[PDB]
Symmetry: C2
Subunit: 515 residues, 2 copies
């Protein structure tokens, strides 16, 4: 699965386009402000607190937990600053709704923001974990009450989450050479470039319901999924770049596959979940069997913070499958982890993920930075405080959905391209068939000439020229031929209608050349 | 190795003590405030900027680079805020001393603090690289002009750096099963618990000059180090917990080892260098053969930020050793990196480190968070703006050295323990021979009785009992029997004389019991 040599070369002309072209991710041009500014205040307050113990030039000291809430509340000015009012409300919420001690929460956030200590414990800060658990539940579990039975491991984005997942599955003999794994259409190729995937046999599954059937999944795709040899199902839900969440038939098919094979392991990458109304996590459907990979990146516009989370149920299939390995393998895993833990046989996979991430020896200084964890906690709190529709929505979320949909409509109306307006489209990316569009406007003869004579780089360099730029960030091509791929995250809203019209100009210009 | 089960059990009674007891690190109880407060301001300013493009509820937009420096300076209030004056001074220095464009440096710091974009490039932000390169040079390279020819890869602490380092050495066939690697005494055991190290033969090397010899290194230690079979040298300099930088003799020996074997690979973990005057980095002595691992953690009181840096010379031994591998090994490495880069055969090791860290496929969203990189940039600027003694010192560094040295003296004077007041001691940790101390005060019969039935855990529990705590954080034991290990980073300065005075009390109680029976 090598990246197009041409797309790699095109990125040399403008590296800013490299992530969308070659990594396949749309970087948002919006940010959420509230958590970012709340973080600032925690640091300011913490520095002030620290000078009470040591105060020498630019050196301060340490912070005492006793009475910290009272001192923070006194330091804040909720009448002047929205961040300050948010900090008080968030701490009080943690107390009244989550049952947490206000001093411990404030101390965690302040020490965490100031960043004066190694992450303790290694896997996740204790108050933060409870916050993220409840946030994930509101956001994506619907009526599944799992927040109290779920363990979390914050990571350096969903990027680090996936790298750690694959490594720990290999190290723990859960994925072995020759194992068959199911992946959802369209396969997110950056994941397939992880070297170890070459040792596994990959099976692409299409769980969409077609009119071909009585609006149901192809029997053949169902059998591929329910194959007793599929050891793990790795999915991106909603999909990149097709932008669709799994509907009821797809979620039912998955639950049936687990009913059939209780040992099935599932990793679900759900970063785009919040962009669809009434999102239902795969973890909420089959929690025993699922590793949930969440990323704050796209909703909150914090791709630079590297904020991901791995979620596992306290009772799960990864731990049970390790328990059913051969004494020989179990004896190798006993030794692997005994160097650093007293009872390695009962060490949970969520903790092995953390040990594995720093090669066992450096496990006791493992963990995501405390500033990243507090950022995760604060973004999480903005939601917990303002959620609607059972936890699915919040005012910021509503704005984010409207922003990507407006960009999408703008592009599609300007280009006269077919729109998907269902509640299952995130509208984060668009895939437009330029060949079908060229045939509609000019005819079959032009399409064939275009099909035979189309170079994607020439197209993108001509588009860049129309906009007086070297290369347009957020426009490229999908896996299929003549399938234009656009991100509604990357450009200013007003650029979308403009790109749409520019594409029709290019197609005319190609038609006049054809003649 | 294996962590001691008793110490691991002792930790489960006060988890706060685990990092020191079992990971061997003293978490500082001080912080630098300036870089932290300046970061804060960049976020405030960047949110303000972001609201110029999109402003809807708690959603803002993006930041335009043109004119950003002028807008930042107008936003700040240097007359009121020390952070603000620093930000202006820091930016102007980048311009006049580093020759950087101010809108670009400002846009890099603000976009970076707001954290609105993936790290680009993946390995290191361009301006931050130059800033950190010059900071490292000042702090540890002395007269070696290497800042313009060094490549940096910021990591999630020296913890991540070491992990990435060993992994990439294995992936690139530079360290193979059965290879012999030299390590400096005392060995840092958490590194030895990396699984792949089970497969290499580890040689401990002692580069201390003794009275036994003519105040020079033992001949058998120089033999071991210069052994043609040693493929790599892995060192913590200055050492933890011995807290000593390599002297001239030790640095000469390493330079001679490199002359004798030009393919020798060195990894030098120099997190404690700023704690000794006139520190001389190994990278500054033998730059072609050395990978430098630095951490901002201990000096800046930022262990929570997770700020590490890997440094390699643009022309290094790692890249050369890779170019001299088999046709079959080179072909495998080609296929490895070709999925993500056009010219894999010429991909530098520093870049391979970054690509390997995210298992090849996720290389284009690899790299350290931009807030972390900007924090490294800001801590670097604090020093560059205020450095003295050729770059080695600065006012904050002079305060940190004084703090650990004061806690060290307090401890030793209280306990009547012998001190090392040399220019080579960081004073970060102390190792005090309790058996020797017991003999001096009460005689050999008592020493022998103590040695025969001394239990470390019960001694630590009695010490905590005296302080009204479950377990004292920053007090434990070294590798040798009867050597108390203390961190001058963990406790208030007032606690040090108190601890030493309590160790003497505990020895007296042991002596009274010895005598009673």
């Amino acid at each position: 699965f090598e990246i197009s040599r041409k797309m790699l070369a095109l990125a040399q002309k403008n590296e800013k386009s490299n992530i969308f072209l070659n990594a396949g991710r749309g970087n948002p041009n919006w940010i959420q402000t509230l958590a970012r500014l709340a973080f600032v205040r925690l640091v300011q307050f913490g520095v002030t607190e620290s000078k009470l113990t040591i105060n020498n030039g630019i050196m301060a000291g340490y912070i005492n937990t006793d009475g910290i809430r009272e001192r923070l509340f006194a330091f804040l000015d909720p009448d002047k600053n929205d961040e300050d009012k948010f900090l008080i409300d968030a701490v009080n919420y943690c107390h009244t709704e989550l049952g947490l001690n206000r001093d411990k929460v404030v101390a965690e956030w302040v020490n965490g923001a100031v960043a004066n200590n190694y992450p303790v414990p290694d896997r996740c800060l204790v108050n933060t974990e409870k916050i993220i658990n409840y946030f994930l539940q509101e956001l994506s579990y619907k009526d599944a009450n799992l927040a109290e039975q779920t363990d979390l491991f914050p990571t350096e984005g969903g990027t680090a989450a996936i790298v750690y997942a694959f490594h720990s599955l290999a190290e723990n003999h859960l994925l072995k050479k020759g194992d068959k794994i199911a992946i959802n259409e369209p396969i997110f190729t950056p994941y397939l470039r992880i070297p170890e995937l070459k040792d596994y046999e990959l099976v692409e599954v299409d769980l969409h319901s077609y009119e071909k059937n009585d609006w149901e999944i192809e029997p053949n795709e169902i059998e591929k999924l329910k194959d007793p040899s599929i050891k793990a199902l790795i999915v991106v839900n909603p999909t990149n770049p097709t932008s669709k969440e799994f509907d009821t038939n797809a979620l039912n098919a998955i639950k049936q596959a687990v009913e059939k094979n209780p040992k099935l392991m599932i990793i679900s990458d759900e970063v785009y979940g919040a962009f669809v109304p009434n999102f239902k996590s795969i973890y909420s459907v089959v929690p025993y069997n699922t590793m949930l990979v969440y990323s704050y990146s796209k909703l909150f516009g914090c791709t630079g913070w590297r904020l991901g989370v791995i979620a596992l149920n306290e009772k799960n299939v990864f731990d049970d499958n390790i328990a059913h390995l051969d004494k020989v393998e179990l004896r190798q895993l006993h030794k692997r982890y005994s160097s650093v833990v007293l009872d390695p046989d009962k060490m949970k996979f969520i903790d092995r993920l953390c040990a594995d991430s720093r090669s066992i020896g450096l496990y006791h200084t493992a963990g995501l930075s405390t500033p990243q964890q507090i950022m995760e906690a604060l973004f999480s709190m903005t939601h917990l405080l303002t959620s609607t529709n059972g936890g699915s929505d919040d005012p910021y979320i509503d704005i984010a959905r409207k922003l990507v949909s407006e960009r999408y409509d703008q592009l599609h109306d300007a280009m006269q391209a077919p729109k998907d307006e269902t509640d299952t489209n995130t509208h984060y990316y668009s895939l437009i068939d330029i060949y079908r569009l060229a045939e509609k406007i000019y005819g079959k003869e032009f399409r064939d000439y275009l099909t035979n004579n189309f170079e994607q780089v020439d197209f993108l360099l001509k588009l860049a020229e129309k906009n007086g730029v070297v290369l347009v960030d957020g426009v490229g091509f999908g896996a299929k031929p003549g399938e234009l791929r656009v991100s509604q995250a990357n450009l200013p809203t007003e650029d979308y209608a403009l790109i749409g019209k520019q594409v029709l100009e290019l197609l005319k210009e190609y038609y006049e050349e054809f003649k």
